Amino acid sequence: YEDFDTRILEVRNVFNMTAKEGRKKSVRVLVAVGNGNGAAGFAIGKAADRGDAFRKAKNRAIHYLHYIERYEGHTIFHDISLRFKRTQIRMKKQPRGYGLRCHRAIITICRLIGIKDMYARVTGSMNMLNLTRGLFHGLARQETHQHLADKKGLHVVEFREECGPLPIVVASPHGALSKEPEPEPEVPDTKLDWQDVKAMQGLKRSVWFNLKRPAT
Amino acid sequence: EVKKPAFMDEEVQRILTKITGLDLQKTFRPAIQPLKPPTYKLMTQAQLEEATRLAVEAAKVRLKMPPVLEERKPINDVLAEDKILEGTETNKYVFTDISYNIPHRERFIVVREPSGTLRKASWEERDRVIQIYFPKEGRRVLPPVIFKDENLKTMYSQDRHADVLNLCVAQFEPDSAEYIKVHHQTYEDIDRHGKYELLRSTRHFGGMAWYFVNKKKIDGLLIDQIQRDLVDDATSLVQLYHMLHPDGQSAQEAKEQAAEGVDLIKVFAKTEAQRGAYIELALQTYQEIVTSHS
Prior knowledge:
part of a larger assembly; 2 chains; A: four-stranded antiparallel beta sheet; four-stranded mixed beta sheet; 5 helices; 10 strands; B: alpha+beta; four-stranded antiparallel beta sheet; about 5% strand; globular; ribosome; Assembly intermediate; biogenesis
């Protein structure tokens, strides 16, 4: 597995009660693994020695490899919002060159997955396990453009502002192309996040927002 | 007298548009600029074809050719000669009327010289001050340095002719000598190196063919159009050459033989082609390939 890299995410050194020494020692280590090409996984390893916990977590994670779909190899296929227990994650698909503007743990995992450009915000509890589980839960349940074309039978067309009105066909239905236009409501019933909308409403952001940071 | 065809003549614009061509991928090639996340729409085959039609409508407006004009004539008019003010000033005054609703070519920009002469501002002085008070995005007050022959040659080595011309349209006026100089230098470089494909599906192809027709050097463009299987374009180019040069030996020969289609190109080769021998060879080879394969 020379093509895979391992990264640590949390290391807890806790003392437990057992008759050997009265209070025994234990190290719980959460790690992540990935080849930077879509395959990644995480595991928890426990031992009395930190070295043993590293080995147990590292080899367990290679058995739980998710495959994450990347749009054009650099970003997620669509915005993703989810709550795993009390940890809320809100990811956004971004254009090339945007970089990884995310929680430091999400940057670590995204490099292992191979995502190069994305935005994410984490709210609620910052529990590392819930953030890792919640991240993989959302990234592994995302809908590729080809899947959407097959489900609805219609063409999936892309419109970039740097390409003008040129329609770009990114996915065509595998079977029979439909002829019923997808219903276009006059006013959508989408549930909007105040945090996303607040910006476009002209409300001042925090002094901490969009600061100059090193390349991620 | 039969009017000499113009660049904007509806007949000339038709022929120049056809030979130029269209390519939605080249016309709408991605710009290297600040980016935004793409949008996505689910569309049927009818909706997609409608969207492609709008893209072709926009590509037409994008390919609108820039004006081809003759070189402006120097402005040398003296409004007054007040000699009482001789020696009372060391520097020229330049006065610009900045009333908003006046066309820039109808504004009064005068110069009071140290000698006392009140004269109209020259063309170079007019363009500089109009940029200072009515600044145009893309244009700079002082002429950029990229237009120097050494710098332009660098852009040609990188095959950036469409850029040299897009910059020449942002900076200089169509009737200025600098505008004509750069265009005629770019068009001449394309000819020598046979780089006609660089300006296809661009707004600059028409002016290039126009320049070659007027200068009686369409040989290279015909040889290249034939080798690319664009023989309908080559025929249209020979029609435009027989339209701007009606009394030419080639135009009179085509009337005598009522030549059409591929015949027109053969007539040009024998009569007025600078390199007729090659036009026939390429034309013959095209016919052989078309006939042999199909």
